[PDB]
Write a protein that binds this DNA or RNA. Structure first.
Ligand SMILES: Cc1cc2c(cc1C)N(C[C@H](O)[C@H](O)[C@H](O)COP(=O)(O)OP(=O)(O)OC[C@H]1O[C@@H](n3cnc4c(N)ncnc43)[C@H](O)[C@@H]1O)c1[nH]c(=O)[nH]c(=O)c1N2
Length: 458
DNA sequence: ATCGGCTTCGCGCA
DNA sequence: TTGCGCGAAGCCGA
């Protein structure tokens, strides 16, 4: 019943007579998960129960309370949802390449399954796991509508090369999800969420008046809330998306990106629901292009350039152009600290930084601006990269994500873009100006909203 | 082929 | 505001 182009064999072996174990990692939800649906099947095709394992890692120390609380409040709800269908969830603390490896032994796992990520480190882990299990090891793309290694086989130069590949594959791969069959047969998150927050408090972004910057109430975490954010977008916001998606003063975005990043909702379900929805076709076309083409070319990009977060993976015309302007006199140079605390000369730029700092989700359009100004106002393209990756990943609820590196790459280095008119400092890299912003939206509204923060933020 | 078209440009202009 | 034509620009893919 499940399309088998979704499964890839990591380590062929003989099946053990124990349970099927889903090493969960990317797709932290219970519904609409091909990898957990696939685990139920081969557990049922062998009469063993299915179980799920998650592994907390030391990565959360590289970002903030905001995301750790987002993720873990998701797991507390997941965990209950899984128990309801009799599927135990066990949570591990440490390096997967050792902990998953042990778990597979201590539990006599018959077969191992994991969801798919393109980030370098998940493959580092897969290979320590492969190297230490005797059972078989299976990988299922639960994140993409069309499995990343099937849509294309090379790096897609631009979205217009990639778009027909994927759409010709859609009619075979866009299906409804079966329901999750309950089966028949470590630590507690409570303490895990407390130790982490006690460890992350020293970094928690505060204002001069001691209070935190972050506003936790713009995005309730979990599978439930995410489903409600999709249903709402589809009824109130999808008709307006094409027209109003570049207005930072509206709130016409879907606001799914923090759910999708953590897999708290399946992008395949959004597609299904949008397709079936009767709205302005131009909005459905413009929205599907984001959640389909751009989301998955971002996976295609990471999976095929391991240097995804470095200057080297820029296309050639862009490396040479930026090189030629390495010795240009930047108008302004800021340090990482100065960007962070919104101390530029450009009250629009600082505004988008206040929106990132306090909410954890910067508007789609401003994110572009945000990034191209860092290039202009740093001493080199490598610092621009570094500052951009650092701030994005540390402050976006949807950061540490393929969409993130591929998005910066587009802004700073023209991955998936094209060559525009040569400029000093920024080369042939597409330019964006404050007056360019002015004909698109009421700049001073934006500026006005977050003006009150910068005075207070230290 | 080899020429047309390319996410989300800026800017004059009506 | 908002829609259009133009400008500078490298490259894939039918
Ligand atoms: C400098 C910079 C940095 C980043 C990003 C872009 C830029 C220019 N992006 C991509 C994009 O800015 C971001 O995904 C949206 O703001 C997500 O918000 P909504 O769900 O509200 O988008 P919206 O409703 O407009 O679109 C819905 C979905 O489309 C996808 N999408 C939209 N724009 C995209 C883009 N340009 N590239 C890839 N996928 C895109 C996302 O999956 C998003 O969930 C990204 N994305 C992300 O999830 N995490 C990140 O940390 C970053 N980092």
């Amino acid at each position: 019943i499940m399309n088998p182009k979704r499964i890839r064999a990591l380590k062929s072996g003989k099946q053990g007579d124990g349970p099927v174990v889903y090493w969960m990692s990317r797709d932290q939800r219970a519904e609409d998960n091909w990898a957990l649906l696939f685990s139920r099947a081969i557990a049922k095709e062998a009469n063993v129960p299915v179980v799920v394992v998650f592994c907390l890692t030391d990565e959360f120390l590289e970002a903030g309370i905001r995301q750790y609380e987002f993720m873990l409040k998701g797991l507390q709800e997941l965990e209950v949802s899984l128990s309801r269908k009799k599927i135990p969830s066990f949570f591990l603390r440490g390096d997967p390449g050792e902990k998953i490896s042990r778990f597979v032994k201590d539990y006599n796992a018959g077969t191992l399954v994991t969801d798919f990520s393109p980030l370098r480190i998940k493959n580092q882990w897969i290979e320590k796991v492969i190297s230490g299990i005797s059972i078989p090891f299976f990988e299922v793309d639960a994140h993409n509508v069309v499995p990343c290694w099937e849509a294309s086989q090379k790096h897609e130069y631009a979205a217009h090369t990639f778009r027909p590949k994927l759409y010709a594959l859609l009619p075979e791969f866009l299906e409804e999800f079966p329901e999750l069959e309950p089966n028949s047969v470590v630590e507690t998150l409570s303490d895990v969420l407390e130790t982490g927050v006690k460890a992350l408090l020293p970094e928690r972004a505060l204002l001069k008046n001691k209070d935190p910057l972050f506003e936790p109430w713009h995005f309730e975490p979990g599978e439930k809330a995410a489903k409600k954010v999709m249903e709402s977008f589809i009824a109130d916001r999808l008709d307006s998306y094409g027209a109003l998606r570049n207005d930072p003063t509206k709130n016409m975005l879907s606001n799914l990106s923090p759910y999708l990043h953590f897999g708290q909702i399946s992008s395949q379900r959004v597609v299904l629901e949008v397709e079936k929805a009767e709205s302005n076709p131009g909005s459905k076309k413009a929205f599907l292009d984001e959640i389909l083409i751009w989301k998955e070319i971002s996976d295609n990009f990471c999976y095929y350039n391991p240097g995804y977060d470095g200057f080297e993976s820029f296309p050639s015309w862009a490396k040479e152009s930026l090189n030629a302007h390495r010795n240009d006199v930047r108008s302004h140079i800021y340090t990482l600290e100065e960007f962070e605390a919104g101390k530029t000369h450009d009250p629009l730029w600082n505004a988008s930084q206040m929106e990132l700092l306090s909410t954890g989700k910067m508007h789609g359009y401003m994110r572009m601006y945000w990034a191209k100004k860092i290039l202009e106002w740093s001493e080199s393209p490598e610092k621009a990269l570094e500052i951009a990756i650092c701030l994005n990943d540390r402050y976006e609820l949807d950061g540490r994500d393929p969409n993130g590196y591929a998005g910066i790459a587009w802004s700073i280095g023209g991955v998936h873009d094209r060559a525009w008119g040569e400029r000093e400092v920024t080369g042939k890299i597409r330019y964006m100006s404050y007056e360019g912003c002015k004909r698109k939206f009421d700049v001073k509204l934006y500026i006005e909203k977050y003006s009150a923060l910068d005075k207070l933020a230290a």
